Design an enzyme around this catalytic site. Sequence first.
Site, PDB file in Angstrom:
ATOM      1  N   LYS A  19       0.840  -1.329   0.058  1.00  0.00           N
ATOM      2  CA  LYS A  19      -0.026   0.025  -0.088  1.00  0.00           C
ATOM      3  C   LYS A  19       0.682   1.372  -0.028  1.00  0.00           C
ATOM      4  O   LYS A  19       1.915   1.268   0.675  1.00  0.00           O
ATOM      5  CB  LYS A  19      -0.857  -0.064   1.154  1.00  0.00           C
ATOM      6  CG  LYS A  19      -2.075   1.041   1.090  1.00  0.00           C
ATOM      7  CD  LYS A  19      -3.182   0.661   1.987  1.00  0.00           C
ATOM      8  CE  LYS A  19      -4.069   1.698   2.306  1.00  0.00           C
ATOM      9  NZ  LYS A  19      -4.701   1.522   3.763  1.00  0.00           N
ATOM     10  N   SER A  68      -9.832   1.356   2.658  1.00  0.00           N
ATOM     11  CA  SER A  68      -8.819   2.404   1.603  1.00  0.00           C
ATOM     12  C   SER A  68      -7.858   1.386   0.827  1.00  0.00           C
ATOM     13  O   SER A  68      -7.368   1.894  -0.013  1.00  0.00           O
ATOM     14  CB  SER A  68      -8.115   3.119   2.681  1.00  0.00           C
ATOM     15  OG  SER A  68      -7.318   2.496   3.314  1.00  0.00           O
ATOM     16  N   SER A 115      -9.921  -1.220   6.711  1.00  0.00           N
ATOM     17  CA  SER A 115      -9.613  -0.864   5.256  1.00  0.00           C
ATOM     18  C   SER A 115      -8.702  -2.065   4.648  1.00  0.00           C
ATOM     19  O   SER A 115      -8.411  -1.814   3.644  1.00  0.00           O
ATOM     20  CB  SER A 115      -8.543   0.528   5.366  1.00  0.00           C
ATOM     21  OG  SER A 115      -9.549   1.582   5.327  1.00  0.00           O
TER      22      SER A 115
END
Lengths: 478, 91, 410
Positions: A72, A147, A171
């Site tokens: 990420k 996310s 997330s």
Amino acid sequence: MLWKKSLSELRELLKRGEVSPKEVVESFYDRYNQTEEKVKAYITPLYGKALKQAESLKERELPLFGIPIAVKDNILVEGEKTTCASKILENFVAPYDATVIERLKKAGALIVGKTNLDEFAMGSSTEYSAFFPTKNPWDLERVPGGSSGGSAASVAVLSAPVSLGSDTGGSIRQPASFCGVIGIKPTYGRVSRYGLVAFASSLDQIGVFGRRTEDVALVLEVISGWDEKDSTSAKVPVPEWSEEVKKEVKGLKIGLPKEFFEYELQPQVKEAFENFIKELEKEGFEIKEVSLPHVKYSIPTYYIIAPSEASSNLARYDGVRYGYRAKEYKDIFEMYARTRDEGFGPEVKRRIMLGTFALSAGYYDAYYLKAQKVRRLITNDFLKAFEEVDVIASPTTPTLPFKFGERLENPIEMYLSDILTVPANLAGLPAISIPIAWKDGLPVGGQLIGKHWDETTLLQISYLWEQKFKHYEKIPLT
Amino acid sequence: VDREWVLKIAKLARLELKEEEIEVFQKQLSDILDFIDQLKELDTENVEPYIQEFEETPMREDEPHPSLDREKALMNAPERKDGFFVVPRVV
Amino acid sequence: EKYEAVIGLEIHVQMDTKTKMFCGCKVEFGAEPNTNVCPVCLGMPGALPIVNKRAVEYAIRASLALNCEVHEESVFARKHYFYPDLPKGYQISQYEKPLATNGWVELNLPNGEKKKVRIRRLHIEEDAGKNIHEGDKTLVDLNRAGTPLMEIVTEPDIRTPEEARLFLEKLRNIMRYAGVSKADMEKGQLRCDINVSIRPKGSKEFGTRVEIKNVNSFRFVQKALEYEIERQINVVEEGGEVVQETRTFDPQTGKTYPMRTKEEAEDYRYFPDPDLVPLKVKKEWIEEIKKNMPELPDQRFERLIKEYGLSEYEAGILVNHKEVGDFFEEAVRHFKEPKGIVNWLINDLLGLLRDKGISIEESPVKPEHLAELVKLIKEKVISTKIGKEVIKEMVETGKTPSQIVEEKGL
Ligand SMILES: Nc1ncnc2c1ncn2[C@@H]1O[C@H](COP(=O)(O)OP(=O)(O)O)[C@@H](O)[C@H]1O
Ligand SMILES: [Mn+2]
Ligand SMILES: [Mn+2]
Ligand SMILES: [Zn+2]
């Protein structure tokens, strides 16, 4: 076809020289080239760089010897851009490795790219990436969640086998659900937050996406332990999860929170979850109704705490030491305020305003402090329920993956995606999202919330469930 | 909630809000604040704010650690000079 | 006089650790800007703080040395404001729940004799960096960012410009004595912010408060206050009301000045730093620091009067400048003639070193050499007159007294 193989299959091939690290990377690279134009998982693909790094990789007995891993883009990888999918941090080159990246590198892993996300980890669909949306590889009209949207997606299409995301309020888990992949957020304190761009310090945790439970168990074990660079990381030994997932514990118990019955679910999700539980019942799990009298307050609580800590953690993006700076300004105030208005996306700005209000004297006691107390009540519900039961189950999400633009009209509509996910973060508990069905072509995730430090059990049940239900064989795009 | 409110909170937060944002944020936030007012109901006198369990405050010996190379430390700077970060003057 | 001056002070003391407050970067004066630096103290994205143990231990030693109650639980709070020398957007200090509270310092006055100023709190915080202005720009050195500081806050107990100075001097001396900070305003290790109101005499309610920021020497604080008190007195008897603000002090004019910029402060949005667990201080540790405390000045002052029969004037000199007492004690150890050694140290050696510009820490005459010189004065080997001649050259050269007695005959 190589990128179609698991880490066990890849490791045995790598250990006996049948394949090389470079070939492995090349395989996933091609799959990336197959899928990326549709998917858009990555902000910064690094297969090129990984190719080169693979040539120098020699010691085969390293736990992750030749494994590609997506990351990420709010976790710092040094020498490469870490954008947090923000204008205010595009062109920021990371000066240091997050501890987890250090530990992966030492384990022989190969960082294959930086994954798209909602800007500053703030959202539930990845639509708030300041650069571009990632799309659900099971229906590109649909969101992959957020996310960690890109990290889930790339693991779904298998442009990487295994992935790192972060989970502040779901997330990792909710994207795992939407993309039909395993995603675990471990106990708060189990994984260092050094080099994780802070959203809400007391809620954030790095976690892992995968398709096989052993893949996830291994990556989690590596990236794991105490970190001296992190005050909140625990001085607790990391359990040998790779050797533990395969084991079977008799007479385990599953709690179904009574208060979750009142939660509006999509019929498909409801149906999927009921079946998940019946099937676990058949395998010998005792199923019990539990009470969590305060859970309904999870969401209000989270949406006071998260934005508060976020306004504080984002005060540092200011155009002084790094990142974006506005071009026109007449005085340092304007430099500040213009850099921020221009560099921050709309969701980020909303939570920053909310945060600075919640922390403002005169409102602090009624907002942040209040919330931190309701948080303890919430935590206590769990602790008490764990006296009777071993894990707590629910759907990961109240709905199937939704469409782009569907939850951008009212920001609140986006928040409501998190109703089943935030309680775990509030209580600091580990939680896993596990693929349990496909309904109308779309993944459905089942969630198990475990006791503090009991990632083992969460992993074990995930391992048993994949034997009954082989979700790792569903691959999306051809 | 007022325009005056949106500005005052922006000032604190250093966001020069554009006129389009002042209208949009007046509603969204007014809503969001109604959306989160759910906690009065609950009694929290006699409840301790949440903190994770530690035994002892984790600390750290007074021993120097290699700093960051000055080069890497400024490389991202929007404007540098002579080893210093540069910003418009402050009065 | 019809009025009374009520003074309270806000001191930030820089702790003499090797390492910064929340990372392993070095604390040291000098040089190269942005040299001792970090993702952490640079407030870079993803960087976490870690508490310096010594800083804490020094912060406890200091609290105790100031008769403060040291709280077993205290909590670091984030203190938010935007400014170029503040890398995070916030300063990690302490708010409600500070380390120490309810203390006091004792003053010795020219003569009211003896007075008390209370310490409201001693909290632990980190320092900001420094700015340098140069043209239309400001240059930022974050070397000093993150340095450990004790913030110390006084009750409005001070009554006089001089007391204000006497306070700071005593505070300094304790810090030095406990050995927690060098605490010289010159080097930037002690800052002090001044708060001043006036009442009419014997009234129990408080007057409007003016704040005087960034005065840089003990002398300057006395001066600033000296003027400011007259300033407010003027305003009040002219029929005007003294307005509550911050002001500044120009060394060159000796005056205090309002500010052109009409800037009110902003909410600090205090709350506990979620990167940090509360500072739990074991009682066993406090006891351990208490038991092994260095000798403090008020105690040294009484011990010397007893152990060496010095006068309150003699011991004061020796205690106020610690290194002189240290010198004196090493010398008396070489030759147990205390009355003689203090004479030749105060009346002779000190004055001679002052004249060159050399401090007593570094003097050519080592305690051994003065004790030796005094010995030849006692045992009548040389005269007081010749003794005064050989001391001038002892300092001039660096030689023993018995070196130069031979070399010049006797
Ligand atoms: N009326 C006054 N006259 C003189 N000093 C004062 C007065 N009121 C407060 N002070 C002093 O101001 C200093 C700082 O006060 P503090 O409460 O920490 O900051 P603030 O008052 O801005 O919150 C203390 O030394 C206190 O003694
Ligand atoms: Mn301060
Ligand atoms: Mn003040
Ligand atoms: Zn540092």
